[PDB]
Design a binder for this molecule. Sequence first.
Ligand SMILES: Nc1ncnc2c1ncn2[C@@H]1O[C@H](COP(=O)(O)OP(=O)(O)CP(=O)(O)O)[C@@H](O)[C@H]1O
Ligand SMILES: [Mg+2]
Ligand SMILES: [Mg+2]
Ligand SMILES: [Mg+2]
Ligand SMILES: [Mg+2]
Ligand SMILES: [Mg+2]
Ligand SMILES: [Mg+2]
Lengths: 337, 331, 328, 331, 328, 337
Amino acid sequence: MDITELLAFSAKQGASDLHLSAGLPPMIRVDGDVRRINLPPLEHKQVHALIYDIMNDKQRKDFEEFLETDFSFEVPGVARFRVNAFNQNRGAGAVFRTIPSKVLTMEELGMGEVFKRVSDVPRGLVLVTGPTGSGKSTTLAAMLDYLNNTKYHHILTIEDPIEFVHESKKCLVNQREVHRDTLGFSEALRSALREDPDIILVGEMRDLETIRLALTAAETGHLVFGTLHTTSAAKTIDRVVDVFPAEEKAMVRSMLSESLQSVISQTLIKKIGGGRVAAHEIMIGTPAIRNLIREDKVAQMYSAIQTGGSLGMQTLDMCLKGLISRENAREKAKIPE
Amino acid sequence: MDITELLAFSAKQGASDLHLSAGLPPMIRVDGDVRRINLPPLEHKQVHALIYDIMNDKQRKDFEEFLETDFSFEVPGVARFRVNAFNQNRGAGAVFRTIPSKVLTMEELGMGEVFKRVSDVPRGLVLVTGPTGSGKSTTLAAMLDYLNNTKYHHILTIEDPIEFVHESKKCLVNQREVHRDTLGFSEALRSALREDPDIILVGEMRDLETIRLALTAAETGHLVFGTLHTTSAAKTIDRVVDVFPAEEKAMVRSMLSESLQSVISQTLIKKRVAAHEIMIGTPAIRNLIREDKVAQMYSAIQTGGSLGMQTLDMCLKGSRENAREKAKIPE
Amino acid sequence: MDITELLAFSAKQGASDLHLSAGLPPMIRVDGDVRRINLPPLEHKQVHALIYDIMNDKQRKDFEEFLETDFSFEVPGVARFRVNAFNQNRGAGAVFRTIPSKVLTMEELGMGEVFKRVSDVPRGLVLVTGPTGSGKSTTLAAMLDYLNNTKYHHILTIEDPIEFVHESKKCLVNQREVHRDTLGFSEALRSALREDPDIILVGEMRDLETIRLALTAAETGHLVFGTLHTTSAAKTIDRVVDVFPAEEKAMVRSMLSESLQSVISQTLRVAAHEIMIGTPAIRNLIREDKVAQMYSAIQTGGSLGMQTLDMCLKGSRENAREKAKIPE
Amino acid sequence: MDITELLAFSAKQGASDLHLSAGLPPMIRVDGDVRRINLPPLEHKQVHALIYDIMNDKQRKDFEEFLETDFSFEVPGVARFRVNAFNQNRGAGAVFRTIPSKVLTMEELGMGEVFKRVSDVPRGLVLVTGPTGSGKSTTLAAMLDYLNNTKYHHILTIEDPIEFVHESKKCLVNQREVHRDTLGFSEALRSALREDPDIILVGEMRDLETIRLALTAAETGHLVFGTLHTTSAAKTIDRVVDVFPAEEKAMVRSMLSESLQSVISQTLIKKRVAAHEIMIGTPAIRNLIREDKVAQMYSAIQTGGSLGMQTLDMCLKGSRENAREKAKIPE
Amino acid sequence: MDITELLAFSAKQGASDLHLSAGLPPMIRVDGDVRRINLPPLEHKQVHALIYDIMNDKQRKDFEEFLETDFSFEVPGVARFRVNAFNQNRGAGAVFRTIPSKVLTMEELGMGEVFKRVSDVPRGLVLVTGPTGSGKSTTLAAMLDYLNNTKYHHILTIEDPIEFVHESKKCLVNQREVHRDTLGFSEALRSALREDPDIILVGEMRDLETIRLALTAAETGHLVFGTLHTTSAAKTIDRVVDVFPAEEKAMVRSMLSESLQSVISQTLRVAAHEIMIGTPAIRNLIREDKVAQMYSAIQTGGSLGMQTLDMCLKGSRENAREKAKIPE
Amino acid sequence: MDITELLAFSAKQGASDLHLSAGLPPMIRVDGDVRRINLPPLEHKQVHALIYDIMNDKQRKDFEEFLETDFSFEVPGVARFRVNAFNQNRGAGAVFRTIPSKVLTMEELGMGEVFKRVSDVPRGLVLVTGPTGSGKSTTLAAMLDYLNNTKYHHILTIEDPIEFVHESKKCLVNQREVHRDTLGFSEALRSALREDPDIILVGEMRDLETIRLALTAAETGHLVFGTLHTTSAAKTIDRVVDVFPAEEKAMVRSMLSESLQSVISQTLIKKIGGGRVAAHEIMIGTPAIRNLIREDKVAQMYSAIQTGGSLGMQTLDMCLKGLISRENAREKAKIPE
Ligand SMILES: Nc1ncnc2c1ncn2[C@@H]1O[C@H](COP(=O)(O)OP(=O)(O)CP(=O)(O)O)[C@@H](O)[C@H]1O
Ligand SMILES: [Mg+2]
Ligand SMILES: [Mg+2]
Ligand SMILES: [Mg+2]
Ligand SMILES: [Mg+2]
Ligand SMILES: [Mg+2]
Ligand SMILES: [Mg+2]
């Protein structure tokens, strides 16, 4: 039972993550929960070998001298994984997080026309948000696949590391892995503006300069897709402005008001009778809402979403009233009722 | 079929852009849509060679060590291209953006005397703005051509890369390509002050230091031309100030109030044709800027017709739906 | 009578601390009081040897060149100790603070459902606070044990040194000893985000960077547990913001308003706790910088299980008043 | 006549200080006045040798490379001295300041129960203040002796240099000489938090970092003792806050409001005898500190007699002219 | 036709500037207008040689590696030039700006007693300001000549490069060329305080440090003359403060309030001047940060010889209005 | 006519400064005015030799590589000078500023009992102020001489470079030259507090840390003497507070209110019928004035000086009404009348 077999098994079980940890049997995360594989405990020596054998010399050196490190690893014909290796009280440990391989279509995900409308906009900013493991990336991949299926455009991506690999259908697709194909988000973004892109994917909007450049890229007239870890349209908007220092808030607020096209905040819910399903809050950037943003009256937006049904807007709670246990629903509702 | 041939072909097809991307055949953008040329897929090795061949040694080094780079490239008798080279999951790639060569005249563009009046000012700051493809450089080129036709002055430009190439008529024209003729906007702007210029073009008022130097250059007594991607005179004025940290905002606001002469915010519309919002820097407006009451400026434009001011929406009242797509106030 | 024997003795006597100090016999702290063990005085040479013998070569070098140092030390089968070694007028000295090994359960500590509710939250920041000794680590250990007993999650900890050692029950538990299993809090925290953790214990809100990363980790969706030495929910909240320079305060304030789930400030014996729970109103208080009002907001939050330190104290009267915000 | 002999002689003469200065004979300060000992002038070479002989190699290096240094020195059976060595126009010089050895008791100093109550607090910050020669260390020594006599606690001190040497009675006493037993106040204070102390002495709340750490140490739950040269409870409280830059003032103010237990500001008067202003940290006063209304505190002291508070002027009402020389309000 | 001949010709034509630009014949600026000399176009190779030949090896290196550079150049018996060398689309280029050599007197410039009164002050700061070209150096040179004619003082100057060369009449005059006679403004200014100067010309208020030292020099008791490119007394005062970071603004404001004696803002031909004189009221305006009021304070300061730019302009009407603060 | 002769001549003429400057004859400053000595012009080569010959190798190197430098130079039996050497358009130049040798007594300077009273105070801060060349230092030297004549105290000085050299009479006098006997003002001041000093001279109060330490030294209970370039008691006080950043102003203001004993602001005036005489504004630190300082109402102080005659206070203008031409007087009066 080598690491290849273990990973293959994890994939067979539909696991998102495989954990090694000295003094424990291998464990896998499935639908959120980490559980032990029915195998013997792995002692430090074994865990250490399993890791050290895969590593290359640099990785070994990084790991050995810094005590921890990150890298990507591939099991030909099975999947790619992002690997983190580290030390803990019992010894070595690692986490192999599976990189999703096949891209799932909007139909496969049960995503309706509203997502297409949101994808279709000719320019601006679209944000897909939610905490870790909420599926944001998969939703994005579907939106990009849809565009790849329908427009003769250029999709350029900046990813750290690249997750989904798309194949060029109608769109030219160029994916750029940070640290390997480019030196950083900033460099790639400053380049993006010179790479004739209709559509630009920016993996995550935390470090300010990325955000500035992302906004510039949207204002300048591209279609920009970014992400955050926020749980509602409002919090998303607060988050984007709040992070900047006072002197810089007004322009960010204005840029955002002009460029923001939609916000999709998302969570996964244990599906009644097994598996999980996504629930989405959806906001669409209409003049009134743009004023709410521009005037700093976002507090009102939640109801504006409530009344935006005709465009396909919906609050998280609304969506939850449409598969899931009422209690599960209430666990995640803004207003438990 | 070398890169020269490919670009020639692209031009023959009226393409705006040529794309190379490892693992694909060459592709071209025509009337918006990217398409494949009927040729075999190009693999990394081939794309890489094609790019390597055009590059000079510095460009190769930049590209090789930084993993991406930008430069201008010329195909004698055909066109000049804005080039970016980069790497991606399948390997190497590059984008060739054609650069329009000839400078079109105010008349050819149907630009009236107001633009001449704006060009004519003896010193200060003039900003031409709008999204990409709004036609900012085009408007600027015409303004500079007009000056070239009429004044015995020195026009200095700093561009990344050089877009329109002017020929010295009455003006001495010196155009400086960033990364090739100079190390950066800042360096060229610091030198500008000692290069006896009357008129300076700065391609895009993006970096704080470029803006500081641009404002210095205008305050010091030259006529400075810059650009932004903003969509109205007000937003332009906010933005120039907004970008600076708190400690520095007041002086930028004051400098700007003193030096700003005009703002021309622009967009292209089908019939394409340009529409312009035009603001002219009168004492009242300068106070609006100085006192931080730019919110009032939009109406001040509305009432400045005598000087040739006009809001974007006003100009749009000279397809109705196309118009409304771009109007501040759809009506 | 070597240092191993001394420490064993200290444990046998239920001492929290063993002191060595040139010119004195060994001394131990028991229920608060430091007292001499009935042994001869130890002279500089002897104390120095006792310390020097335990130290490893780096520790010896640190100690010799910096004149003082800290390290952890273990007596197999007895306990682990937080050791500090230093110099004083009569010569060398050292202080061994024993480490509580056994995890105690919420029930063993008489901690009620409110702690479970606080533990249960799916993400955000929870702060357990109080002066030295006050029992923060213990309260945390119980909270983590409860999670370990109930959820199939990943608990990652970062500690300087590791205090309590948990055994993986339903949770996978990874404990990381600073300086040994990782180079620092920052490194481990930056790594944490990519070690698929549900729950993260940050042993020390050591520096601004640790706090930043802790907040990032909470905001990103994990459940983070941290500590401060503050004595009340309000002071805790102030302190988290106060420590940052002006330019950075607003964002920390905002991040905190969004992510903070609870604050538990504590003192010891039996533990008394102030408990605050992160409701919208309180989040506004934090966001708007009106935390001054929060103390009463705690007073009126009984339904959720909130309570002021003084309230809890109303469950010796004098001992109580020694530690009350409002002696009455 | 070596330096040992000289110091012995100084002690024999009841001198507080011995001065060496190249180009002069040794000199001693007695009852305030500096005088020459009946000996030949000492030239640079001689003074330098005399100093070199006492110094250890580090002290020599410090002195040689930094041109001046400080250290403690002991003459067995006579006294300990605070030493500073330095250079001046005529050459080398040094100052030997005698350090009083024995710790005097509260009773010997006529200090009443209030001082015990202040000493007794379980944690927080206590500040003893006044100009040089006011008797701050003396008061502190007595407070620590009292604790040494009564509690089974750990007293840790950090001193530059160690002034009074305590002997471990009920308390474990660890005294740390800066530059010799530790590298600095900050290092020793950072270690203190891990040296299981009940009570910590910090000789002079002068540097920001020392203050920050002192406040941390008090807030974290220890009883911290510090000193300043301020002359009243209010001024002391202002000063502790004043010294910090704006961004940091609020937290220092808050920390202090929570942790401050007492302030004892002191001066010596002929009859010498000590006079004390005494403040005790009650909720009302803590608010005064917290809200930044310390201006009111002086009267709050006036009305705090029941707890043993007293203004400097009040205490002075227990020569009338000598008294008035030192009164806040001469009357 | 070498560069010496070209420059000689430019001087013969009374040109302010000579331009070289690959692909063009030499061009000269005369009374504002740049025009071609009747000569063949100069190609890159030729322009490059012309420049390369004058340059020294460092200059060549600077130019070659940085792509552009600045230096001074002298044509014995003709003039000195401020040379800038650079690159452009057609190839090399360069700009030689002639240096006004001859000092002109206050009388020759029609400058009245007010300038003498301003020159005469025993210490403090005097600022002569205005856009490029406006005639600041000239106005200064006249002020210094007047002092040179009347006081037995020490005039020290620091310049990049030296423009006007004074001859020692009653004053000892020491002129220091930056990069050649001194390493920088800062160094020279720090030195100035110990070169026993009565009067100091700071050629460029180059950076914050220069300003600091200039202010120190004025405050310390010397008479300091400096320049800025601002267009009015108010803007000058604002600018001197604005340039500093927040923490430092107050002290600069205060120093300036105390030391500032006069501001002379100027434009060109004939010169027009705005003149402000440092009276207590104005000093308060500066100190209290109410400079906004100063413009009228100038209007009412005629008795001392103050005058707004617009006032002076009321001594072609259109030309006048081109440069008026208030066109009327 | 070598440099020694030149300097001797300058001293014979009572000059404060001798200037060399390529292309000019030697010039000397006497009573304020620089005038040419009746000698031939000195060309670059000669000036350069005159300077280079005196310099030591380090000084030559400093000078040669930094293009300018400073040092002290001594002409045995004549005087010491502070020398600055530099380059200018005509070539080399230098300034030899004579360091005053004999110390002048209060009587020799016509200073009355008020100065003694001010000197006599047991502790606190005394400031002697005035622009360059106003004689401040000489006044101080007289005050120190007086103390040296009368008290058995320790006078410690920190000077950059040491000007007047005092001889130990009743006081022990230790003078410390900055850069030579100590590394800096701060170091020496931190040492001073440990060197048993009754009286401490701090040469100049500009760089903040020196001021902080100076104030500490005064508050702690020594008698501190410092200087500034200000022209009146008020401006002196404003100057000391104004220089600090906002957060630090209050404590400086308070420290100063408690410690300040007197301020003596001074100027020299061309004496009618030849030479010059000093005029002084004198303020003495009484409780009322201390409140003015403490409460930040220094604006009132000028009149408080006017009414402080009994203690020997006087405004600059008052003193001017007591040797000098009325016009000369008005040149320097706060209120010309
Ligand atoms: N009371 C007085 N009457 C006449 N001349 C005096 C004088 N006091 C000083 N001088 C002369 O004035 C010159 C400067 O004196 P001093 O050096 O004491 O002033 P100062 O304290 O301003 C030095 P600095 O200019 O460096 O601040 C010297 O030539 C000195 O002899
Ligand atoms: Mg993802
Ligand atoms: Mg353009
Ligand atoms: Mg603990
Ligand atoms: Mg003491
Ligand atoms: Mg000039
Ligand atoms: Mg002096």
